[PDB]
Write an enzyme that holds these catalytic residues in place. Structure first.
Site, PDB file in Angstrom:
ATOM      1  N   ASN B  33       0.744  -1.425   0.164  1.00 23.71           N
ATOM      2  CA  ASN B  33       0.477   0.211   1.024  1.00 23.71           C
ATOM      3  C   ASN B  33       1.071   1.348   0.184  1.00 23.71           C
ATOM      4  O   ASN B  33       1.405   1.467   0.777  1.00 23.71           O
ATOM      5  CB  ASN B  33      -1.036  -0.426   1.263  1.00 23.71           C
ATOM      6  CG  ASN B  33      -2.021   0.580   1.154  1.00 23.71           C
ATOM      7  OD1 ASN B  33      -2.472   0.797  -0.044  1.00 23.71           O
ATOM      8  ND2 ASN B  33      -2.016   1.399   2.512  1.00 23.71           N
ATOM      9  N   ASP B  98       5.869  -4.768   2.782  1.00 23.35           N
ATOM     10  CA  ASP B  98       4.753  -4.153   3.158  1.00 23.35           C
ATOM     11  C   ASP B  98       3.471  -5.056   3.054  1.00 23.35           C
ATOM     12  O   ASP B  98       3.460  -5.844   3.193  1.00 23.35           O
ATOM     13  CB  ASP B  98       4.951  -2.586   2.613  1.00 23.35           C
ATOM     14  CG  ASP B  98       3.558  -1.928   2.844  1.00 23.35           C
ATOM     15  OD1 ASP B  98       2.377  -2.251   2.074  1.00 23.35           O
ATOM     16  OD2 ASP B  98       3.541  -1.220   3.715  1.00 23.35           O
ATOM     17  N   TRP B  99       2.091  -4.894   2.696  1.00 23.33           N
ATOM     18  CA  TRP B  99       1.157  -5.589   2.223  1.00 23.33           C
ATOM     19  C   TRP B  99       1.896  -6.784   1.703  1.00 23.33           C
ATOM     20  O   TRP B  99       1.250  -7.836   1.840  1.00 23.33           O
ATOM     21  CB  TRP B  99      -0.717  -5.277   2.200  1.00 23.33           C
ATOM     22  CG  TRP B  99      -0.766  -5.079   3.206  1.00 23.33           C
ATOM     23  CD1 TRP B  99      -0.767  -2.962   4.163  1.00 23.33           C
ATOM     24  CD2 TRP B  99      -1.551  -5.413   4.300  1.00 23.33           C
ATOM     25  NE1 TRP B  99      -1.500  -3.227   4.971  1.00 23.33           N
ATOM     26  CE2 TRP B  99      -1.508  -4.385   5.186  1.00 23.33           C
ATOM     27  CE3 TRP B  99      -2.153  -6.594   4.408  1.00 23.33           C
ATOM     28  CZ2 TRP B  99      -2.287  -4.842   6.670  1.00 23.33           C
ATOM     29  CZ3 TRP B  99      -1.814  -7.208   5.854  1.00 23.33           C
ATOM     30  CH2 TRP B  99      -3.028  -5.811   6.354  1.00 23.33           C
ATOM     31  N   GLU B 122      10.405  -4.824   5.667  1.00 26.27           N
ATOM     32  CA  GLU B 122       9.617  -3.726   5.934  1.00 26.27           C
ATOM     33  C   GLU B 122       8.031  -5.245   6.024  1.00 26.27           C
ATOM     34  O   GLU B 122       7.215  -4.169   5.749  1.00 26.27           O
ATOM     35  CB  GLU B 122       9.305  -2.697   5.131  1.00 26.27           C
ATOM     36  CG  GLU B 122      10.747  -1.862   5.457  1.00 26.27           C
ATOM     37  CD  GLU B 122      10.539  -1.357   6.771  1.00 26.27           C
ATOM     38  OE1 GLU B 122       9.296  -1.285   7.385  1.00 26.27           O
ATOM     39  OE2 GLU B 122      11.181  -0.981   8.018  1.00 26.27           O
ATOM     40  N   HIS B 274       9.700   3.184   4.930  1.00 22.04           N
ATOM     41  CA  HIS B 274       9.502   2.312   4.577  1.00 22.04           C
ATOM     42  C   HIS B 274       9.769   1.535   3.132  1.00 22.04           C
ATOM     43  O   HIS B 274       9.576   0.718   3.186  1.00 22.04           O
ATOM     44  CB  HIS B 274       8.305   2.976   5.097  1.00 22.04           C
ATOM     45  CG  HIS B 274       7.390   1.323   4.831  1.00 22.04           C
ATOM     46  ND1 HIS B 274       7.376   0.105   5.490  1.00 22.04           N
ATOM     47  CD2 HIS B 274       6.033   0.904   4.846  1.00 22.04           C
ATOM     48  CE1 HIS B 274       6.795  -0.629   4.993  1.00 22.04           C
ATOM     49  NE2 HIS B 274       5.467  -0.341   4.788  1.00 22.04           N
TER      50      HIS B 274
HETATM   51 CL    CL Z   1       5.724  -1.484  -2.457  1.00 20.17          CL
HETATM   52 CL    CL Z   2      -1.244  -0.077   5.127  1.00 25.28          CL
END
Ligand code: CL
Ligand code: CL
Ligand code: CL
Ligand code: CL
Lengths: 301, 303
Positions: B33, B98-99, B122, B274
């Site tokens: 995200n 991330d997700w 991350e 991030h």
């Molecule tokens: Cl990403």
């Molecule tokens: Cl998020």
């Protein structure tokens, strides 16, 4: 702070080496060529530290190693390197090598076929049938010819002495002429530092005279011929980095060479000279460290 | 050359970017995200010599379709499953942030034969409370408490809608706020393009509300708990990239976390946010390509 310098007393002299990474990780030997020292791996070893115990020797007569009164032939180089490896008790290691470092690595793996866990190499030495094989390429020639002429001179009696012993040409001209990036003043200082006296430059003159070209000298031609046949038979993983247009190894030749081997991947670096570490430390160190992690993972359970 | 492709999946369509020779091992790149496969553009070309690189746009992201769905973690999981099946990918390396790591861990938990290797950074794990979210000991503590505050506002009813649906905060503030270099106009435009309309922004709102924090939501917590337990027991090769000071994963946490897993090397990238791909694409692409070459050569030698 991360890289330390060490010395061991061997064969009646001393060998220096640089060290980083965890003591308990697999051994990784970084092998420099002419006229460099373990200094050329300084931005590559910290990238490999998280996965290997990085050991980067200075060849006898190079860097911080001793300067004994010896012939400085290829076989002398092999003997000093073996002595250090044995003194440190290294029985199994990855090899990462360039220039005369690859000749040393190939000859090492040939004589010690259980040692090598993987070979990462670039800009390597092989038997060359004729001068047209030294710096062979297809890109529209002027550079290749001028390197041939330099090394033809280095190999000429009296001429080679004047260029290298008297003027330190290998360090002052050949080295920076073979790297794209502009070396800093401190970087040149560190390359010339072992080579302050005329006598101390002998090893740098001895090595272009050891190049296996047109069968001369025969001893090196024959040893490197045996080493290349062992390389072609070996089963360990290999990573071959290649620059454009390539000095000793063009992208086209790398591709064709890699097919003659087992489990060799080719990594194109893009534009470079002979000494790829100074233009691509990050691409080399990153690739090597991931490659080791891979091999260690896949090999274990 | 990276080309963009489409496939009809479930109730919509999915885009993916592809590069590399079709007979090398599959390498799946999973974004989070609020990015798209665009984030892998400088990384895929470095892995292309050793792998068949597929980079999907998640349902609702990039060039993928925009169905009237809830865009929950499981909707993402379902649309990615279906694209993977449609593409006939049975075995793959996974490269994820991330997700995209949540999806990866969840994928590997349900299909353990699929994974040749996992390169991750991350990553999402169930977090017991907010101090877990963005934990570090570096004295920008200001930047960390701020991130927590942002995400608490995202999870607040009415407030998250005004921040994200009305103002497009995840695209316009969180994304560039989490990358060290300045994005070009062209780069922002490519991150904006999927989120031009107010109603398009919905996927970017739902995901921070999926983040498993203090057991909420219970269901994602339970799925990601299961997924972390299978990751810890798994035997495939792993690379964990880590930045300083760390957003979701500090170097200190990455060291403790690597001790929990089998065959995981920790790669230090140095200063980053991030989103690591925008500051370290060469380091990531080079590392991954190298790791794949090493796993493929050692596996060939063995069998
Ligand atoms: Cl990403
Ligand atoms: Cl998020
Ligand atoms: Cl060298
Ligand atoms: Cl030489």
């Amino acid at each position: 702070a991360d890289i330390s310098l060490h010395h061991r007393a061997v064969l009646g002299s001393t060998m220096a080496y640089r060290e980083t990474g965890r003591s308990d990780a697999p051994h990784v030997l970084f092998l420099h060529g002419n006229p460099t020292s373990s200094y050329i791996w300084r931005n590559i070893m910290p990238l490999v530290a998280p996965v290997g115990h990085c050991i980067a020797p200075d060849l006898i007569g190079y860097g911080q190693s001793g300067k004994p009164d010896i012939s400085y032939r290829f076989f002398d180089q092999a003997d000093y390197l073996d002595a250090l490896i044995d003194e440190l008790g290294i029985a199994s290691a990855y090899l990462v090598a360039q220039d005369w470092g690859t000749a040393l690595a190939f000859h090492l793996a040939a004589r010690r076929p259980q040692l090598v866990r993987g070979l990462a190499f670039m800009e390597f030495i092989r038997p060359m049938r004729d001068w047209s094989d030294f710096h062979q390429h297809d890109v529209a020639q002027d550079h290749a010819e001028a390197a041939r002429e330099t090394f033809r001179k280095f190999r000429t009696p009296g001429v080679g002495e004047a260029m290298i012993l008297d003027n330190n040409a290998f360090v002052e001209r050949v080295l920076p002429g073979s790297i794209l990036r502009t070396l800093s003043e401190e970087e040149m200082a560190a390359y010339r530092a072992p080579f302050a006296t005329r006598e101390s430059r002998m090893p740098t003159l001895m090595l272009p005279r050891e190049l296996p070209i047109a069968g001369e000298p025969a001893d090196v031609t024959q040893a490197l011929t045996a080493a290349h046949a062992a390389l072609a038979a070996s089963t360990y993983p290999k990573l071959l980095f290649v620059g454009s247009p390539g000095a000793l190894v063009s992208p086209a030749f790398a591709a064709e060479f890699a097919k003659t081997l087992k489990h060799c991947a080719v990594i194109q670096l893009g534009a470079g000279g002979h000494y790829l570490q100074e233009d691509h430390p990050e691409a080399i160190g990153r690739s090597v460290a991931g490659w080791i992690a891979g091999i260690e993972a896949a090999s274990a359970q």
